[PDB]
Design a protein around this motif. Sequence first.
Motif, short mmCIF file in Angstrom:
data_model
loop_
_atom_site.label_atom_id
_atom_site.label_comp_id
_atom_site.label_asym_id
_atom_site.label_seq_id
_atom_site.Cartn_x
_atom_site.Cartn_y
_atom_site.Cartn_z
N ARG A 4 -13.17 -7.61 -4.30
CA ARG A 4 -12.91 -8.16 -2.99
C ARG A 4 -11.45 -8.03 -2.66
N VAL A 5 -11.15 -7.20 -1.68
CA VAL A 5 -9.78 -6.85 -1.40
C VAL A 5 -9.10 -8.06 -0.82
N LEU A 6 -7.85 -8.27 -1.18
CA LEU A 6 -7.18 -9.47 -0.74
C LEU A 6 -6.26 -9.06 0.39
N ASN A 7 -5.38 -8.12 0.09
CA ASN A 7 -4.48 -7.51 1.04
C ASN A 7 -4.12 -6.14 0.59
N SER A 8 -3.47 -5.42 1.48
CA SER A 8 -2.88 -4.16 1.14
C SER A 8 -1.50 -4.12 1.71
N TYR A 9 -0.68 -3.26 1.16
CA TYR A 9 0.66 -3.09 1.66
C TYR A 9 0.97 -1.64 1.61
N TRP A 10 1.89 -1.23 2.45
CA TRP A 10 2.32 0.13 2.53
C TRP A 10 3.06 0.48 1.27
N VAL A 11 2.79 1.65 0.72
CA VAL A 11 3.46 2.05 -0.50
C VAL A 11 4.33 3.26 -0.28
N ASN A 12 3.82 4.22 0.46
CA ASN A 12 4.56 5.43 0.69
C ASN A 12 3.87 6.22 1.77
N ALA A 13 4.49 7.28 2.26
CA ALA A 13 3.86 8.08 3.29
C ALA A 13 4.55 9.42 3.45
N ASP A 14 3.94 10.47 2.93
CA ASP A 14 4.52 11.78 3.13
C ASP A 14 4.12 12.25 4.51
N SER A 15 4.22 13.54 4.74
CA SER A 15 3.82 14.06 6.02
C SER A 15 2.32 13.91 6.27
N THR A 16 1.52 14.09 5.23
CA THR A 16 0.09 14.17 5.43
C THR A 16 -0.61 12.84 5.17
N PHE A 17 -0.05 12.02 4.29
CA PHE A 17 -0.76 10.86 3.81
C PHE A 17 0.05 9.60 3.90
N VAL A 47 -4.61 7.80 2.65
CA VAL A 47 -5.18 7.91 3.97
C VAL A 47 -4.45 9.01 4.71
N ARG A 48 -5.18 9.98 5.25
CA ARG A 48 -4.55 11.00 6.06
C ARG A 48 -3.96 10.44 7.32
N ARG A 49 -2.76 10.88 7.64
CA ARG A 49 -2.06 10.40 8.81
C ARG A 49 -2.47 11.17 10.03
N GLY A 50 -1.96 10.75 11.18
CA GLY A 50 -2.21 11.42 12.43
C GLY A 50 -3.41 10.87 13.14
N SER A 82 -4.19 1.72 9.91
CA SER A 82 -4.35 2.51 8.68
C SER A 82 -4.30 1.69 7.38
N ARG A 83 -3.69 0.51 7.37
CA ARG A 83 -3.94 -0.45 6.30
C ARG A 83 -5.35 -0.91 6.31
N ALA A 84 -5.95 -0.94 7.48
CA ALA A 84 -7.32 -1.37 7.57
C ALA A 84 -8.21 -0.32 6.96
N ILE A 85 -8.00 0.93 7.32
CA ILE A 85 -8.84 2.01 6.84
C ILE A 85 -8.73 2.19 5.35
N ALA A 86 -7.57 1.89 4.80
CA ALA A 86 -7.37 1.98 3.37
C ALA A 86 -7.95 0.79 2.63
N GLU A 87 -7.88 -0.38 3.23
CA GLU A 87 -8.57 -1.54 2.70
C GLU A 87 -10.07 -1.38 2.78
N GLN A 88 -10.54 -0.61 3.74
CA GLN A 88 -11.97 -0.41 3.90
C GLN A 88 -12.49 0.72 3.06
N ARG A 89 -11.69 1.75 2.82
CA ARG A 89 -12.15 2.79 1.93
C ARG A 89 -12.36 2.19 0.58
N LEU A 90 -11.38 1.43 0.14
CA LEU A 90 -11.39 0.88 -1.19
C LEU A 90 -12.50 -0.12 -1.41
N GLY A 91 -12.72 -0.98 -0.43
CA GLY A 91 -13.61 -2.09 -0.61
C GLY A 91 -15.03 -1.62 -0.52
N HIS A 112 -6.03 11.02 -6.98
CA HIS A 112 -7.23 10.78 -6.20
C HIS A 112 -6.94 9.86 -5.05
N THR A 113 -7.80 9.90 -4.05
CA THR A 113 -7.61 9.07 -2.88
C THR A 113 -7.57 7.61 -3.24
#
Lengths: 95, 203, 93, 144, 39, 56
Positions: free
Chosen positions: B113-126, B65-68, B97-106, B33-34
Motif C-alpha cells: 500500500r503506497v504511502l507517498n512518492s517523491y521526485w527522485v530524478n528526471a532525465d530527458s525521457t523519464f 515514468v516517461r515524460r512529455g 506524474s507522481r500519481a502515475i508512478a504511484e499507480q503503476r507501482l501500486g 527496470h521501470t
Amino acid sequence: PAPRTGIIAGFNKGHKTTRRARAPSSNDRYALPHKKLRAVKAIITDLVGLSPMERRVQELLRVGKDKRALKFCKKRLGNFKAAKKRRAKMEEALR
Amino acid sequence: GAFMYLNELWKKKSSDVMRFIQRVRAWEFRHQHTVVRLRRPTRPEKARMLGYKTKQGFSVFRVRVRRGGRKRPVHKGITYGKPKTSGVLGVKLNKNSRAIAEQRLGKKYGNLRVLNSYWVNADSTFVWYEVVAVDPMCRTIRRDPRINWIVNAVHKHREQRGLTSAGRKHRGLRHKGHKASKLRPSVRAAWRRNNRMVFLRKR
Amino acid sequence: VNYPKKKTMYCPDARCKAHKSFKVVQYKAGKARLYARGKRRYDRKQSGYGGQTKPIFHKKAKTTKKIVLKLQCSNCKSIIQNVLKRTKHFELN
Amino acid sequence: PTRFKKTRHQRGSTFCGYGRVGKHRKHPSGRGNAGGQHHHRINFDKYHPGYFGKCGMNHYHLKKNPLWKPTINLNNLAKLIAKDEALKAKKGETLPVVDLLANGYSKLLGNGHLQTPCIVKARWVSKLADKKIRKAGGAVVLQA
Amino acid sequence: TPAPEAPRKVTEEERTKNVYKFLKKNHSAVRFFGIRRAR
Amino acid sequence: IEKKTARLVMIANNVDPIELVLWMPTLCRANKVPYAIVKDKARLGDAVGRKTATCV
RNA sequence: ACUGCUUGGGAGUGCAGUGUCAAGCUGGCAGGUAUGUGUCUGCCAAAGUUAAAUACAGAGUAGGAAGACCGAUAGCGAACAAGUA
Ligand SMILES: [Mg+2]
Ligand SMILES: [Mg+2]
Ligand SMILES: [Mg+2]
Ligand SMILES: [Mg+2]
Ligand SMILES: [Mg+2]
Ligand SMILES: [Mg+2]
Ligand SMILES: [Mg+2]
Ligand SMILES: [Mg+2]
Ligand SMILES: [Mg+2]
Ligand SMILES: [Zn+2]
C-alpha cells in the motif's frame, strides 16, 4: 489598537467595542529570521557552488548589465520581488 | 540537524555537484527496470517526511515514468465528432506524474500500500519517483499506531483512487476556499450537489 | 472630396464657447491593442482545439466609409470630432 | 387535478385545440429563446427591449452582505415604535427610541410627513430624514 | 446571549447637529482620502 | 560537529546517497572540527560493531 | 512562460505537459482586473490519519413498515419449472 467610533462610516467605522491588540501564537515567528536555517544554507552554497542561472547573472553583473540581470532573473523566477532579492543577495556574494 | 543539511543540499538541484550526482543516477536509473525496489530511499530525509520509517514493512520503490504529454490513443490519429474534441498531440493527461508512478507501482504490487512518492530524478525521457509502499501485513506495521491506518481496508489502493498526495494535487485538493469550491468534496460530488434536482417534499 | 485644412467650427470648451479655427486631422482607427477586454476573450477562446471560434467577416459590400474628422482648437487639447458623408477619396487641403 | 384540464374537455375533439391545419408539432420555432435575434426579433424587441447587450461595469465576486442597507422611511417609523409607547411624544419631552438594526433597517430615508418625534437610531440617514427628524423635535443618533 | 437594549429619552444636543453632514463628512473623509492626498 | 564537542570526525568514503554526508566535510571545515574521510563505511562499520557507519 | 483541458472564475478556477524554478535577515500564500510599489487582514502549502450528520439515481445480506400505485395485453421481461422455452 485605535478605538472604532460608533459611527458606521469614517476612519474607524465600527461598533464601539474595546479592541484587544494581540497576535502572539507561533505563526508570527515565520516573520522572524531563521539564523540557523541560513547557517545551513550558507554551508550548502560554499559546498555546491553557484547555479547556472546564478553564475549567468553574475557574468552580467560584472558588466554594467544590472537591469539585464533582474530582467533575466524574473524570467527565471517569475516573481519580480524574487528576482530582486536574488540579484540583491548575489550583489553581495560578488562583494 | 542533519536533515536540515540534507534537505537544503537537495534544494540546490541545479548546483553542479548535485547536478552531477543526479546525472550519474539518471544514467544509472535508465539501465534499470521501470520499477526497482531499494533497500533504502535515495532521499532518506524526503522519504521520511512522507512517512517512510526505516522499519520492517516499509519498502521503497523507484518507479520510472516517461515524460512529455499524452498522445490520445485514437486510431490513425483521427478524431470524430466536433473539432474541439479533435487534437491528438496537444491535449494533456489530467493526471499527475507522481500519481502515475504511484499507480503503476501500486497496481504491480497489490501486496502493498503506497504511502507517498517523491521526485527522485528526471532525465530527458523519464522521471523517477521513489514510492514508499507499506506492507499492510508486516506485524511491525499492524502494531504501530502511527501507520496501521494503512492496514485498514479503506486504503487498499489509495493511489488508484487518487488519495495519495500526488493524486490530491491533480485532484485540486491542495486548495481550500474559493479556489476549490467546484472541486471540493470531489469534482463529482460538487457536480451532484449542484446538478441535483432537489424536490422539497412540500416545495 | 477636398476639405479645408482648417475650419472655424464651434467650440464646446469653456475656454471657447465660440467659433475657432480647428486644426483638422483625419481619424484613422487606432491600433487594435492586445489587452483590450475583448481581445483577451477572443485569445482565450482561440486557445485549444476548436478551430476558429468566432465568425470572421469576409464579404465587404461597402467601398467607402464615413470620414471622421478629429479637430482641436488652438486654445486647448480637446478634440471635438465629427463625421462627414461617405467618400472614395477624402483629402483635405 | 386532471379533472379540470381542458385535456379532458376536448377528449373527442380530435386536435386538442391545436387546429386541423397548422398542426400541433414540436418546436415550430426553436427551443426556448431561439431566434431572439431572428424570427422572434419582433417579440423580444417589443417586450424585452434591453435583453440583448451589455450595460455596465462588472463586479467580480459580488458580496451582498457588505452591501446590505435596507431602508425605512420616516413615514413608517410607527411600525417600530410601540403604539402604547408612542402615545405621548411631545418634541420637547421624552421620546421613544428606535434602534433600526434591531428591526432590520439600515438607512433612514426621509419620506413623508413625520410629525411624532422619535430618536431614531440608525447606520445611515437621508439628507432630508435627519432634517425632518430634527424639525419634528426628534433626533437620529448614528450607530453602526 | 447577552446584548444591549435602550429605554427612551429626551432629545438633548441632538436637535442641533445634522447627523448627515456628520455622516457624510466621515464617509467622504474615507471615500476621498486617497484623492485628497494627491491634491 | 555543530556543538563542536567533537574533536575528530571520520566521514566514510562511500555512502548510498553521498548526499547524506556530502555536506559534512564542509560542515566540519566551518566548525573547524578536524575531520577525515576514510575508505569504507564497512570499516567504520566494524570499528563500531555496526555493519556500516556513515560517520564516527 | 508556453501549451492543453477545465471552471461562473472573467489579463486564469483547478489542473496537466514542457521549459524555468523560489523564498524563509522587510518570509511565504490568500485577500475574485494585470503590473510595480506601500500599508493592512487571515492564514502557513508542497506529509499523514480522522467518527457523525451525507449517497445508495439498475447492488447486495437479514429482516421490517407501507401505499389515494398496477391488477394478468396491466405491474418487473418474468403472479407460472423466468432471464425460462
Ligand atoms: Mg370544433
Ligand atoms: Mg388552442
Ligand atoms: Mg393530421
Ligand atoms: Mg402552428
Ligand atoms: Mg401552413
Ligand atoms: Mg452583469
Ligand atoms: Mg467547458
Ligand atoms: Mg509548510
Ligand atoms: Mg404481464
Ligand atoms: Zn476650443
